[PDB]
């Protein structure tokens, strides 16, 4: 194996090298390129990756700096995050309408939220601030036209009604909105965020995307079947995001119901996604060549989000941290690929490097996921997410409410 992770010093060094290798995929800080995105989209034959994955990358680097103290990439990341905000400072840039799903917008919002929680340096005074960007995403997601009576509520996957998939009310869209609301409640101490988060979680439970018996977390259902045609694929990031938001709700509310939800979601995740201590993407990983570019990034979110759960729901620490350690050990074991001797693949549990070309990408998601897993080994040494008591970001009471905002011509 190339990377060492047995001590704090070794983990820092490994994370710094992993941060370098992941950055090689990113061209957006170079002359003539677009900040904030990885190469793509594949629909234009520009590269393998969609817009939302750029937002995921930004958040991974906000976390990297928080966990390691290394600010080397902070300028590049601030530039990327700011470039993609759109004219209404809401992460709805219209050039990206095809990529405008509530989830895609949500991931950008979550990265802004993370920047506020982590005290990431503020943008210039005349630019949108991190908390305000998170508030704008949440506000647009709470807008009445996104909450119709079909399936008794819930967000649709897509924002534009003409986007393919507008008829799919899926877990990830709702989980993003839930997680933002829970996080905004904790940061701002404003209970209206929390009331929305409660409502959306209760909807996910009622519609049966959360299994009442096992606490498995399914993918979604379609409005023309009243959401009853549940797609029971279990993607790791769905359960993990609900766990993350539930942990923020437990920390904010101190309500035993939320502690029980954390515990039940966590039991399910350990049962379903961790295979002898290693995270495993159950709908696709069992054979090579099935995971999409998006799926290759999920395990990295699992690691980062579960690590934060241990800070804000500290009773979970002993269930989570040993398992994240075994999973990260497997991640680095297989980061041995040519031509560098340290290239990372996806198939951690297998114990073997598999070239990312088997899944038809250059390998940025796998690189991101290992970076996430290794960095998050430092969670014990990191500060917990800040609230407005110690944060440095600023909000906006009219975030998401501009008169030129897209909701005004829906
Ligand atoms: O990969 C599982 C995932 O697949 C579909 O959404 C894929 C992917 O689309 C991107 O554009 C972005 O929206 C991202 O969040 C999403 O993962 C969909 O069927 C979804 O429900 C499912 O979880
Ligand atoms: Ca999308
Ligand atoms: Ca490709």
From TrEMBL:
It holds the Pfam family Glyco_hydro_76. Its main location: membrane. GO terms for cellular component: endomembrane system. Ca(2+) 2 binds at residue 104. Its EC number is 3.2.1.101. InterPro entries: 6-hairpin_glycosidase_sf, Glyco_hydro_76, Mannan-1_6-alpha_mannosidase. It is found in: Endomembrane system. It catalyses: Random hydrolysis of (1->6)-alpha-D-mannosidic linkages in unbranched (1->6)-mannans. One of its GO terms (molecular function) is mannan endo-1,6-alpha-mannosidase activity. Disulfide bonds join 151-227, 284-291, 335-344. Ca(2+) 1 binds at residues 48, 360. One of its GO terms (biological process) is fungal-type cell wall biogenesis. Keywords: Calcium, Glycoprotein, Glycosidase, Hydrolase, Membrane, Metal-binding, Signal, Transmembrane, Transmembrane helix. Belongs to the glycosyl hydrolase 76 family. This is Mannan endo-1,6-alpha-mannosidase. It comes from Chaetomium thermophilum (strain DSM 1495 / CBS 144.50 / IMI 039719) (Thermochaetoides thermophila).
């Amino acid at each position: 194996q190339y990377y060492k992770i047995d001590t704090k010093e070794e983990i820092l060094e490994s994370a710094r090298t992993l941060a370098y290798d992941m950055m090689l995929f990113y061209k957006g800080n170079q002359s003539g390129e677009i900040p904030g995105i990885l190469p793509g989209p594949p629909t234009e034959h520009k590269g393998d990756y969609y817009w939302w994955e750029g937002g995921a990358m930004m958040g991974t680097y906000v976390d990297y700096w928080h966990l390691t103290g290394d600010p080397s990439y902070n300028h590049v990341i601030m530039e990327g995050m700011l470039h993609q905000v759109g004219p209404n400072a809401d992460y709805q840039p219209p050039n990206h309408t095809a990529s405008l799903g509530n989830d895609d917008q949500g991931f950008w919002g979550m990265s802004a939220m993370l920047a506020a929680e982590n005290k990431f340096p503020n943008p210039p005074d005349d630019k949108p601030q991190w908390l305000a960007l998170a508030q704008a995403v949440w506000t647009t997601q709470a807008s009445p036209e996104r909450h119709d009576g079909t399936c008794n509520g819930g967000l649709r996957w897509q924002i534009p009604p003409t986007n393919a998939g507008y008829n799919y009310k899926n877990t990830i869209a709702n989980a993003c909105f839930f997680d933002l609301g829970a996080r905004l409640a904790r940061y701002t101490k404003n209970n209206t965020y929390a009331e929305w988060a409660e409502k959306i979680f209760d909807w996910l439970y009622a519609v049966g995307y959360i299994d009442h018996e096992t606490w498995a977390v399914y993918d979604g259902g379609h409005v023309e079947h009243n959401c009853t045609d549940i797609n029971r694929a279990q993607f790791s990031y769905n359960a993990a995001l609900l766990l993350h938001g539930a942990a923020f709700m437990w920390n904010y509310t101190e309500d035993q119901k939320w502690k029980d939800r954390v515990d039940n979601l966590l039991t399910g995740i350990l049962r379903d996604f961790f295979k002898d201590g290693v995270v495993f993407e159950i709908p696709c990983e069992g054979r090579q060549g099935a995971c999409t570019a998006d799926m290759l990034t999920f395990k990295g979110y699992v690691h980062r989000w579960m690590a934060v759960v241990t800070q804000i729901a500290p009773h979970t620490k002993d269930r989570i941290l040993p398992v994240l350690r075994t999973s990260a050990e497997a991640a680095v074991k297989q980061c041995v690929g040519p031509p560098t001797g340290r290239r990372c693949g996806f198939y951690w549990k297998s114990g073997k490097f598999v070239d990312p070309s088997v899944d038809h990408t250059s390998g940025a998601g796998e690189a991101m996921s290992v970076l996430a897993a290794v960095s998050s080994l430092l969670i014990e040494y990191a500060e917990p997410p800040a609230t407005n008591e110690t944060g440095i970001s600023r909000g906006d009471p009219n975030a998401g409410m501009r008169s030129r905002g897209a909701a005004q011509h829906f």
